[PDB]
């Protein structure tokens, strides 16, 4: 039942600011020091900052020092990270971690919040273009030029789950994401049977179904 409850990420342009919050449940935050750790898409854990139990200090990783301010509202049992002068490379899932010590600093982290995605980009919200990957055969949908993440794709309104692969999005140089979804299927059925991919991108309020048939 002990847990850290994070809040407050999102999409923000370079130079601008965001504030993350981390709320305790079910213990008193006011006794423990707090870490933040971030993780960039498919890269590793990178430690960011730490605040002492009463907020007397205050440690920052080199990559963020002078740009981020960690703080504490002990009467709300909440901890804050102020992220200023944002840069694309600050894109990542950010985690607040409780420090094992408290009332003193160990430097290890026993309890972790769910994570918050933070995207730093010049790109504008744009929904995907959906192009057929025409065809035991293989077929798919190419979901191209959308921002921001994420998208979801199903096949035949969710009836087809056998042998689908939806590949991690790639960020192209241009600032947009792209992705393909593939399914393998018996060749003795192409013209007989229908295949529809269903693509949703909530940020742009865009639903697209696309029928994929051969030649």
């Amino acid at each position: 039942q002990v847990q850290l409850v994070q809040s407050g990420g999102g999409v923000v342009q370079p130079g601008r600011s965001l504030r993350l919050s981390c709320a305790a449940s079910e213990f008193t935050f006011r006794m423990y020091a707090t870490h933040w750790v971030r993780q960039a898409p498919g890269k590793g854990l990178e430690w960011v900052a730490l605040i002492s139990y009463d907020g007397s200090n205050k440690y920052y990783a080199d990559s963020v020092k002078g740009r981020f301010t960690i703080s504490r509202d002990n009467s709300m049992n909440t901890v804050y990270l102020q992220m200023n002068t944002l840069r694309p490379e600050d894109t990542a899932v950010y985690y607040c971690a409780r420090d094992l010590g408290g009332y003193f600093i160990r430097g290890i982290m026993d309890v972790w919040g769910q994570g918050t995605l933070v995207t730093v980009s010049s790109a504008s919200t744009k929904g995907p273009s959906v192009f057929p990957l025409a065809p035991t055969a293989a077929l798919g949908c190419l979901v191209k030029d959308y921002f921001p993440e994420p998208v979801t794709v199903s096949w035949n309104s969710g009836a087809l789950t056998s042998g689908v692969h939806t590949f991690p999005a790639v960020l192209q140089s241009s600032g947009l994401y792209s992705l393909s979804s593939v399914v393998t299927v018996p060749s003795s059925s192409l013209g007989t049977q229908t295949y529809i991919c269903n693509v949703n991108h909530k940020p742009s309020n865009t639903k697209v179904d696309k029928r994929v048939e051969p030649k």
Partner: protein, 212 residues
């Protein structure tokens, strides 16, 4: 400036195997070193602290040992839920520093990819852009080795790969490689081929098509 180095980056092994991971720190940490377990899209768990002290909830098959510079973690008999990435963490001076981590992946028998090529849609061609997709389906291991070849000429910096996590049912992988080009430049060549070389294939496989 403190540098934590993890080795190997990836290890493949089998339910029940014995496995061991290395963490070297470029300065004397003494013994302030933690180990974390992370599964895809979830927060890390504490496992070992102070080199060798197991956390509360942790199975006894997890052991850790080291002092000064060289550190180790061993899972004695690897259970299905133990396949994850593993992070070591120096806790000696601020700034604190994690390792680049080691992935423990499940091992199985070699599986040749099935290879497919997909010319761009005519729909995409009206936009003024051409994507060509080459799919590698259900294979093991993840290594390979996709080369684009247009009019027989080798290609560079023009294609991005992407790969799935191990299949929950058969431990296989799948990979897509996508070649993007302007419509104008697409229309200048005739032959488009991806060549796949992978352990489970004797010689490379080449799929091709002729524009039009």
């Amino acid at each position: 400036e403190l540098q934590m180095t993890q080795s190997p980056s990836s290890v493949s092994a089998s339910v029940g195997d014995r496995v061991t991971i290395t963490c070297r720190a470029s300065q004397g940490i003494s013994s302030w070193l933690a180990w974390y377990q992370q599964k895809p899209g979830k927060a890390p768990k504490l496992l070992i602290y102070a080199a060798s002290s197991l956390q509360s909830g942790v199975p006894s098959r997890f052991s850790g040992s080291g002092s000064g510079t060289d550190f180790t973690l061993t899972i004695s008999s690897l259970q299905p839920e133990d396949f994850a990435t593993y992070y070591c963490q120096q806790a000696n001076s601020f700034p604190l520093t994690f390792g680049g981590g080691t992935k423990v992946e499940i091992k199985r028998t070699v599986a040749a990819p099935s290879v497919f090529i997909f010319p761009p849609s005519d729909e995409q061609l009206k936009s003024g852009t051409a994507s060509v997709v080459c799919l590698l389906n259900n294979f093991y291991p993840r290594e390979a080795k996709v080369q684009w070849k247009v009019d027989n000429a080798l290609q560079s910096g023009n294609s991005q790969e992407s790969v799935t996590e191990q299949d929950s049912k058969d431990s296989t992988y799948s990979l897509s490689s996508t070649l993007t080009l302007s419509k104008a430049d697409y229309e200048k060549h005739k032959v488009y081929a991806c060549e796949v070389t992978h352990q489970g294939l004797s010689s490379p496989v080449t799929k091709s098509f002729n524009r039009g």
